[PDB]
Design a protein around this ligand. Sequence first.
Ligand SMILES: [Zn+2]
Lengths: 48, 542, 79, 318, 182, 103, 388
Amino acid sequence: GGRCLAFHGPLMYEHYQGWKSSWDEWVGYDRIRAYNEENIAMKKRLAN
Amino acid sequence: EEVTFFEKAKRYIGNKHLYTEFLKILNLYSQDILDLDDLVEKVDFYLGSNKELFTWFKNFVGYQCEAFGPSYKRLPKSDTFMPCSGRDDMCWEVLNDEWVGHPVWASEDSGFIAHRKNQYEETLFKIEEERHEYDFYIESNLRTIQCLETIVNKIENMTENEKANFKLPPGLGHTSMTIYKKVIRKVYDKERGFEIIDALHEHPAVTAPVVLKRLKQKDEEWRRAQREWNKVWRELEQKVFFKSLDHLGLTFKQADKKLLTTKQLISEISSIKVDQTNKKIHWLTPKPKSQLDFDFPDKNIFYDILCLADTFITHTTAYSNPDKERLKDLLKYFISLFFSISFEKIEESLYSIFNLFANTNIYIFFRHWTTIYERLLEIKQMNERVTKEINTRSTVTFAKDLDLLSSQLSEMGLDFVGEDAYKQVLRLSRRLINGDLEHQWFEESLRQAYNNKAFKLYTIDKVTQSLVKHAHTLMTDAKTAEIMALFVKDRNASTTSAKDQIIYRLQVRSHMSNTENMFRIEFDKRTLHVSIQYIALDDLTL
Amino acid sequence: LRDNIQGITKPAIRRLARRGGVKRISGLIYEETRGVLKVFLENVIRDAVTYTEHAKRKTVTAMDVVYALKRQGRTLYGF
Amino acid sequence: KKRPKRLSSQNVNYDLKRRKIITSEGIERSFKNEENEDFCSACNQSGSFLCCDTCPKSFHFLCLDPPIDPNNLPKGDWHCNECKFKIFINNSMATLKKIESNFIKQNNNVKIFAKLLFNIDSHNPKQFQLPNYIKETFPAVKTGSRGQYSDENDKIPLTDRQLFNTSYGQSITKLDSYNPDTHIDSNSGKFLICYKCNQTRLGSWSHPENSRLIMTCDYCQTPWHLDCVPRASFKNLGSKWKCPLHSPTKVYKKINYKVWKKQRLINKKNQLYYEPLQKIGYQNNGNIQIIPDFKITQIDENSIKYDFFDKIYKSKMV
Amino acid sequence: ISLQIPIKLKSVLVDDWEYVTKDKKICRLPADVTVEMVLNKYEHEVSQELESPGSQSQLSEYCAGLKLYFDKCLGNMLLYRLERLQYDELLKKSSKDQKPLVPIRIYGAIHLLRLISVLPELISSTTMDLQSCQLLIKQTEDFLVWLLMHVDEYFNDKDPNRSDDALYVNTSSQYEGVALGM
Amino acid sequence: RQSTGKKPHRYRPGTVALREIRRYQKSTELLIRKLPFQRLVREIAQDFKTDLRFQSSAVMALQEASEAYLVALFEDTNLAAIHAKRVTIMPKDIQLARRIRGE
Amino acid sequence: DKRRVAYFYDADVGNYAYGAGHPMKPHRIRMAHSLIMNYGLYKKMEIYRAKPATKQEMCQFHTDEYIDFLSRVTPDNLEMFKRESVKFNVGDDCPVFDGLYEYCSISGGGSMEGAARLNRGKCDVAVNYAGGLHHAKKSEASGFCYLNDIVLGIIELLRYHPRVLYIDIDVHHGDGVEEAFYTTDRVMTCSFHKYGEFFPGTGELRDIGVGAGKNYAVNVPLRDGIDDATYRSVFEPVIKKIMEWYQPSAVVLQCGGDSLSGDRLGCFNLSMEGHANCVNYVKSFGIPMMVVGGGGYTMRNVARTWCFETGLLNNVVLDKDLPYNEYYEYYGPDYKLSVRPSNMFNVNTPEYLDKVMTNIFANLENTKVEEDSAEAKDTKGGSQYARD
Ligand SMILES: [Zn+2]
């Protein structure tokens, strides 16, 4: 349900979206959203 | 047992999401929101099967309004205010103006779907419209011709002075006012039709004779066209209608291929196995050993699939001569050995408890055998009525005089009259296996031979080929051939039950691999009863 | 048989342009290419239909298609 | 051996198609010579359309500010509201220099709304449409094809492939033909066990009548037989098939009455506020969730069982 | 320019959208409470609640502006295509009665909530002064929390299928066919 | 009738297009699928004459001839595109090529 | 035992066709009547021709505007006639044809004439094959049905009889009659049809009426391919229980071939015997019964089954031989009076039917101008030359 529900940084989850199939990982650790880590730190500080 | 009721419900539900929804419903009841009736309805689908738990819940809770269905919403009283001059007090007290149903609300703004029909049914409906509009125009013209003939008869016996002035209201002195209007509008033009209608109405006995003549010749040519179309309609519908009546039989050619496979029968026996096991887990710890049983009341049916089998042996060309000979010998021997029949008593002219532990190929072979047996029982049980109906087929004399009876299958000898239907369909199956029957004609013969009830014999050659190919694997496979040899050693027709079948099971479990399926087929000499038990992965766990 | 002009898919036209060395393919080229192919087929198949009707045959052979391509200066080899 | 070539006659051709009989043979000598658009960009729906001569926008007969009826439609040229504002007065003559401030100066200092009142005339009439920020706080709802309400209760429309050309046996229906694929789920390949009776009831191909139809729930994927719950056929068109085991949207408690049309969920932003403090006697009127402004609580099985036992132990005396 | 609405009013608006488009239920126009007495009660409550520092002039100005703008905006951005037939026959009845109908006498507060919902689009599409815009926003939030203080007596959930009053009536087949059809 | 209804590769445009040009120019196999072209051929032929059949080899010859003609037309269209100081083809270039060809 | 049967025919009821490629067709009634007179049933029967209804006589359930609209319906000026087209939902699902006013008038006249003949005691069984329309609402036309003449017949029966029962046995059940009699207690409606993505979409086990009409609307949802045995098992005991509890004074039966094996939009697998034994069972009670016909998109099967209904109502067993009529080419290659059942799947399980029966039993256990008004005036019409 919904359109944004991910334990990692959200990528319109309804698995790493927008990447190949050889990158999946389903191990168990702590989860934090943080709004995609402040939107990858305001897009790497606006491309540094 | 109030303390242990909740975990009992938790183990009964199993799923976590359904348990949370049950807790939400139960708390909704707890917060003075849900009354007793809706709780009773909820536990009717929740714990309806558990009779002990439901009776305890009813005794412990203390159980001793309108339905308001999804349709017929209540209109406001503003829409009720309508004059409705044809309504008296009884109509006011018997009719409701505040309840209206509209199918788009039932569709929830998504529409509705119609029933899917076969293509032959669509051509049959097209034939129905083509035949309908022809004679509908014909008899509308006939009614207008009759009205104009009554008019002409009234003109025939009075003078010219009242002939010049014969003003009439719309209707031509009859109870209808628009049949003739539609007839003249269809015969003539759109703009000219209104003016000739106006002429006929205000000035009769001048345009009316030529209108009657035009309508008479139009009716004559329409009747000639209908007569020349009726023959084509009859002969095309002779092959359209019976194919349209067959719904499952048209798809049977592919359904029998897709559904009579190994994995489908594995699924359909494992479904019954898990149903029996969890039903007993709910009810009682012991489990029955009988499931998917077949009854064998007739002994000549084995002889019938024997005849079909050795007819198929002499037809195919993909096998060698000694391979065909050993396949026919194995097919005869397995029937003579499993069913305790000494030999074949049909080997002259007019031809051309015990436990079985087997693998999956023998399972599929036996399932094909029992399927053909059940099909032949469905043929034979109604055969005494079908043969009586065919032998007493009272043909219509008027159809014979006009040559209207269906003689499509009677020319090539596909008719079932004057002979037994079962022997005739056995010969038809033999020749269809021989490959010189033009199979769709055999489908048509089955369609108008048993009134579409013989739809399971449509792929008799296909299931015979599947049976032959599955019996071919009984000797080529080393494990299956060794299983047959161990059945030669095991079968002795002596009272030695319940002392060596455990050894049979042990040597089979040591003989078969882990991925191979496990079966127990029990056959009884009395009443020819057979039972199959699915014991897959129930012996290698220890 | 209806809506069979869409059987020639958009990546099929894209691959056909790739065979021709086309760098970039517009979104409006697909309908125009489908129309051009429809006109060419409506000429060639009609010519083959006339060729088959002349020979009192009910199905059209590849030789009649070869003749229909040859008569318009587009001769085809291998059939 | 059908013959539609010679036995199809000359007077009457293929039915449902007229011919030249009503035109060529119709001589009666008995009288003895005596820019626009087609999408309706005010409600995004279809129907009878009216358009302006010099404006590409087309409207409905009722979506117009003063709804007009087709039986008394005005004659001559018709114009929209901004057509009266742009091609007509206040733009071509008497150009807009300070008439907007004159609206405040004339309409008795309504300046906080006079600009919107003036912009009303420079605005086409349209149906109500929910704003974007109103829609974003409810992620379960969405806009439909023509602009109707669409929450998770309503099922997605079926495509034409599954509905028209879905072969014969299938026919978008499992009531016809043996359909063993409906009893097997593709997630694990196991058997779908019904909730009421714990049987899949697949049956056999030799006995198709012993098979019982089953369906998958659209929320929790719970299998359910068609004979246990009272229901005739499947649910493919319309709303999603809600099994009678979840929380209903609206319940009735006659005592006039209370409806309680749920809360339809709030997204994972700061509006969703959690506060688990009390487990007994909260009177939270529902909208709970289970864990191992719109106020919600982290309730569990123990608290629900406690308040249930408390309420039915107070209510058994009455 | 950003405006906030409490989640109860957003849920009410979403339920109204569901009633109109999905459930096919228009609002009960012959209702007990209309927009004029809504604004009159709001103005009286805020006038008798606080002191008198000179804000009653702008309070009455805001009330009169909201009344006039709801009068001349009701057929522009509110009024779903389903309710257009109801508006048409009410206008026909008023034309037969030789009287000039204004929407503040018959329309409920749900259309006012719709107007407050579409207000940021109207402010963003118009050239307005900053201080007047903030004053209008502040008065909007004041009215929104006043409506939040009186939800129970004003927006009560009731079903028209079994009650005489639900501030909502069911649409007929003829009504739906005329409105959502031609 | 009774119914109510980390960084990705991120290839720039043009390089993969030239890669496909080099792959399909040296290739041999047919780009257009068999049955869609066959169904289009039958649909076109049914407008001229009904109850008509095509053999597999006739469909093959028609498909290869149409592919070669469309490849030549696309070559002329691309040549006109570079001639018009462009790398993107337009349908007006196709119409111009057809007009120059005389068809 | 022996009962007099009044047959109501009109020679003008079949002269109107709805359109090309149309499911509904009044042309089947003419060949059904030709089958009736071709079987020699006129010697033990009485036949009258009913007059067409008027505007006021058709206003007895519908509104004034709907009746005026239907009287002023004309296909030539359909271009400007678009407001009332919708609302009365005419022209979208029910297209406009010439003679709609006349066809509705004949159907209504036949319906209330059957009701009046049942009321006055002149006949025991009233058969009106000219009109059996049941999908018509108060101001809505659906299912190619325009005027709800069955409601008018029930009203005319209620003028003399205290209780009237309506029985529907075909698919696409009449929601108009149930809507007209949802709240009244003197009218009980029982119907058998398919539910689930079906054109009407109305009728549940929970749908039994509201107010004073609580538990007075019986609806039996069925599935595809129901055979004759399961149809008998779902019909006869519930009909006996309805007669035991409700005790009606009149029965309105909507016979039709929509529930037959071959149909256009139908879904059932009933033969002629399965469709006829229910009528025989409801005739064996002895109480008066009204028979109307408004179903059956097929034609050849519906004519044979209407002839079989007439023959069973005539207390005679019809032979399988089919004589010569002017509509003889419609029939199958066997040319016998027999509707052949199809072999499609019988998905109607006995357990689901038993659950429906228990729900119905638990619902029904609590049941224990105007110058020419009242009708009772028809032309004789004894000179019929339909025999061939
Ligand atoms: Zn129907």
